[PDB]
Each structure stands twice: as structure tokens, then as C-alpha cells.
Structure 1
Amino acid sequence: LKCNQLIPPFWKTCPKGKNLCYKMTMRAAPMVPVKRGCIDVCPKSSLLIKYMCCNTNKCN
């Protein structure tokens, strides 16, 4: 599995046992996926911050 990076097509390889891709967005303004990488489990949505979790190549 590999995920995206922020702006640049650097992508970001997932380490073993950490094979989601997330992108962290705002609840108030999910315009910019401001944080990005691979995670063990789904980071959960909050009031101020939203996620989308997945598992696909250059998903996120």
C-alpha cells in the first residue's frame, strides 16, 4: 500500500501493520486535507476536525 503526500507527488509509503490511508480535514472547512499519512486504525471524526479513512493505493 502507498498513500499520497500533501502538495507534491512524493506519495508516502505505508509501514507494515499500518495500512490505512487517512486525510485529515476540518469540520468547519474541509477544503484542505491538511494532514496525511498511514495509520493502524481509522482516526475518528471530531467536532472541529474530520477524517476520511480508507485502504487503497494513492487514495487519500
Structure 2
Amino acid sequence: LKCNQLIPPFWKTCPKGKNLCYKMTMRAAPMVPVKRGCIDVCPKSSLLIKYMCCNTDKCN
């Protein structure tokens, strides 16, 4: 269970508990990928920022 952060080859193995990941793109702008990382589950997405969470590696 691992996930890529932004774009060039740089992913990381997620820690126990957090077998999921995400990609916080901004809704303010179209979908600007600001954050990306290893979590468990997505928090409350803000109207200004979309939290694109998943359980599968690479998805972010």
C-alpha cells in the first residue's frame, strides 16, 4: 500500500492504519493539486478545496 504524491517519481509507503491516500485539489481554481498524501479517510471537503481520497495506490 503506497501512493505517489505530486508528479515526478516520488511515492511513499503509507503507515499502518492509513492504508489509504488522497489528493487535495482546489475547487477555487478548477482542480489544482495542492496536497496529496497517506491517510485513512477524507475529511470534510471544503467548497474551495476538493479532497480526492481513495484506497488505491497511485490514485493521487
- What TM-score results when the alignment is normalised by the length of structure 2? 0.82
What's the C-alpha RMSD, in Å, of the aligned pairs?
1.4
Q: What SS does the corresponding residue of 1:33 show, helix, strand or coil?
A: strand
Report deviation, 1:43.
2.2
Q: Is the 8 A contact 2:21 2:40 kept in 1?
A: no
- Structure 1, unaligned runs of 5 or more: none
Structure 1: 4+ residue segments shifted above 3 A: none
- Structure 2, unaligned runs of 5 or more: none
| Match status 1:13 vs 2:18 | no
* Alpha-carbon distance in structure 1 between the residues aligned to 2:38 and 2:3: 7
- What TM-score results when the alignment is normalised by the length of structure 1? 0.82
Number of equivalences: 60
Report deviation, 1:32.
2.5
Change (3 A) 1:30 1:2: farther
Higher fraction of strand: 2
**What does 1:18-57 correspond to in 2, within 5 Å?**
18-57=18-57
